[PDB]
């Protein structure tokens, strides 16, 4: 059985979402060395306690994804489930209290019309490349992890992502969250991921297209994460899908915040839906089988660090379990027993190979 790394998947998911959010107090700070210190004095990662660190809005629309695919249920229609995700992204603004939920992300919720003909859509906007799609997105790969299903997978990442980023650097961030938990789902090499998804880009072009809306927008902005993916995989020396990945001989904490800021757009690494899962993969590919590493690298910076650790800890949940992972980081988290039912769901539905009736 693989249910466990299903359960790990949400809940480690969430709790990175915590821990790099630490109630709002790491973004006071902006900065690694600072934060890395503060850890120190609470005793280190293993030592601590999230029963008073609030999960963020990333978890929270992580489980509204996550609750809409189990509510559509086997072989749903995907107007149905369209409908389903729309719904639960308006509603979950709710739950919003003390969370610092994103601008696109607010704005576009409250505009969705649940129910109404293709009443889930929304214009194109330069201004829709932030990280709230790809934050989100993870459990649709967790649904949806058959090679037979992954046109599904592609169609079902970008409409979720574009229900509030209807930008490629926006939704094309939910399409990485979604494929690189499919792959982790599959035991893919980690180092093989980055191929994996510069291969699938012609075919989420395909259906931006075929789809047809705002085509012109979507294709002409098109090469911004491209650009970012490719440059970021060379700079590794996993372009090829089949080498282990090389590192800078200096790369401390000081290092990765010069770095992550160096791949993001506005100065604050994380904060954008290119660069969000790739600052995740980065983590993911340095620490192997180590939560702490992990931790270190997508929880602990000075950029957008709930939303980076968000994606992080859903990857290596599905790798790993909860395998060297300080109870105490988890057990009395926020929404824990929630979490761990919706990842019995969602096992029962992906675990499945099923076929959905596309638009
Ligand atoms: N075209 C673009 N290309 C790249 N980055 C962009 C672009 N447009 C905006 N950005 C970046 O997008 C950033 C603004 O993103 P926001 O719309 O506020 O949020 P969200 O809806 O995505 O929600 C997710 C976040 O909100 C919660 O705090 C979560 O923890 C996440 O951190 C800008 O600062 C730009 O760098
Ligand atoms: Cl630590
Ligand atoms: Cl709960
Ligand atoms: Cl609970
Ligand atoms: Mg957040
Ligand atoms: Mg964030």
């Known amino acids: 059985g693989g249910m466990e790394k299903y359960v790990a998947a949400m809940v480690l998911s969430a709790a990175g979402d915590a821990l790099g959010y630490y109630n709002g107090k790491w973004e006071f700070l902006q ?23 609030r999960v963020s809005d990333d978890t929270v629309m992580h489980l509204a994804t996550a609750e809409a695919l189990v509510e559509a249920g086997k072989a749903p229609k995907l107007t149905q489930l369209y409908y389903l995700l729309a719904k639960h992204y308006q509603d979950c603004m709710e739950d919003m209290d003390g969370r610092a939920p994103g601008g696109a992300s607010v704005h576009n919720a ?14 194109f906007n330069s201004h829709e490349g932030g990280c709230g799609a790809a934050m989100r997105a993870m459990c649709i790969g967790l649904r949806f992890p058959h090679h037979s299903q992954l046109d599904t997978l592609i169609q079902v ?23 690189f938990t ?20 012609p075919e989420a072009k395909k259906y931006i297209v075929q789809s047809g809306y705002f085509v012109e927008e979507n294709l002409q902005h098109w090469s911004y994460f491209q650009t970012k993916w490719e440059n970021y995989l060379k700079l ?21 915040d010069q770095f992550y800021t160096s791949l993001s757009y506005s100065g604050w690494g994380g904060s954008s839906g290119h660069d969000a ?83």
């Open 157 to 179: 990442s970008i409409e979720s992502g574009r229900m509030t980023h209807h930008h490629p650097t926006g939704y094309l961030g939910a399409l990485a969250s979604a494929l």
């Open 236 to 256: 590794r020396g996993i372009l090829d899908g089949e080498s282990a990945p090389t590192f800078p001989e200096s790369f401390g904490v000081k290092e990765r």
């Open 110 to 123: 409250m505009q969705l019309k649940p129910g109404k003909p293709n009443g889930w859509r929304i214009p």
């Open 182 to 201: 499919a792959y982790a789902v599959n035991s893919r090499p980690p180092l093989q991921w980055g191929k994996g998804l510069m291969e699938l880009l």
């Open 277 to 359: 899962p790739m600052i995740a993969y980065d983590a993911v590919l340095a620490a192997g089988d180590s939560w702490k590493e992990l931790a270190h690298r997508a929880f602990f910076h000075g950029g957008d660090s709930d939303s980076t650790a968000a994606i992080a800890g859903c990857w290596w949940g599905v790798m790993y379990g909860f395998k060297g992972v300080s109870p105490s980081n988890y057990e009395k988290l926020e929404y824990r027993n929630r979490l761990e039912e919706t990842a019995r769901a969602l096992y029962s539905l992906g675990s499945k190979e099923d076929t959905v009736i596309s638009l």
């Open 31 to 53: 900065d690694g060395e600072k934060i890395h210190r503060q850890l120190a004095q609470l005793g280190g990662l293993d030592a601590l306690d999230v029963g008073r660190w």
